[PDB]
Design a protein around this ligand. Structure first.
Ligand SMILES: COC(=O)[C@@H](N)Cc1ccc(F)cc1
Ligand SMILES: [Mg+2]
Lengths: 150, 151
């Protein structure tokens, strides 16, 4: 169906962008809103309400640029805003070598049903936060499975 | 001012802030503002954005060596319609010989539409505008803003 094709296109755009940033160790934080509304966090960023493309996602997270500091929040198959605040988790059970991107992802996943993707600037490793847990060192296939399950 | 007029002022502020940033840093840019002649055929050659304007997004688009920086951004009213768009190259002899493809594209679209195109030179940081087949170079910030306000 059209809705199915659209979801698959968005998944492909996300994984292409994450693959580019993982290879270049570009830090990134991308939260996908689900049933829990995230408007209060969306309002903290720069409004975009933009079509998703791998190109735009990459251009957003380029280091040393206006939009790269904070989270992209996606809602209704669009990029709602960039450079958004997410709350930092205080969980003592996050790997101690991880910093604030990952604690922000876990933080929002504590208080919403959202799925957040993190690319590490240290390693290029890719992780996902959901339900208060961080799933680390994902392959491309693992991230796709998580996006399709979501 | 009405909401339409306030929105236009916000859009002009975003554009001028972005252009000023990119001029200082010698970041090449090519930004076409659609007016009454529709540019859909050119918009369709780019990557669709249909995004709300901000100075931040405009700057991020044109950062060198990124997916969206090559080609034109085309704006429709208060939205960035698409980036990395094709524009036709002018053959006009009144384009300074040292100028490259961004200025020739801007004059090109200005020959077949009523649009206003802003160009930042990656060589000098100079700001120019193309409109109605003419290129006006080395604009001050004040001149650019007045041109946009008049547009
Ligand atoms: C060298 O390649 C890698 O680091 C990947 N295994 C990481 C990676 C994970 C998800 C994705 F959508 C793209 C890339
Ligand atoms: Mg002069």
């Amino acid at each position: 169906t059209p809705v199915e094709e659209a979801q698959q296109k968005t998944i492909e755009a996300i994984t292409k962008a994450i693959n580019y940033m993982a290879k270049r160790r570009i830090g990134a934080l991308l939260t996908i809103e689900r049933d829990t509304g995230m408007g209060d966090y969306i309002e903290t960023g720069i409004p975009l309400n933009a079509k998703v493309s791998s190109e735009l996602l990459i251009n957003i997270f380029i280091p040393n640029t206006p939009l790269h500091d904070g989270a992209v929040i996606m809602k209704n198959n669009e990029i709602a805003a960039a450079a958004c605040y997410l709350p930092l988790s205080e969980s003592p059970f996050i790997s101690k070598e991880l910093g604030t991107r990952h604690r922000a992802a876990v933080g929002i996943s504590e208080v919403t049903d959202s799925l957040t993707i993190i690319v590490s600037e240290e390693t290029g490793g890719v992780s996902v936060a959901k339900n208060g847990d961080l799933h680390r060192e994902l392959t491309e296939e693992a991230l796709k499975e998580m996006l399709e399950a979501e």
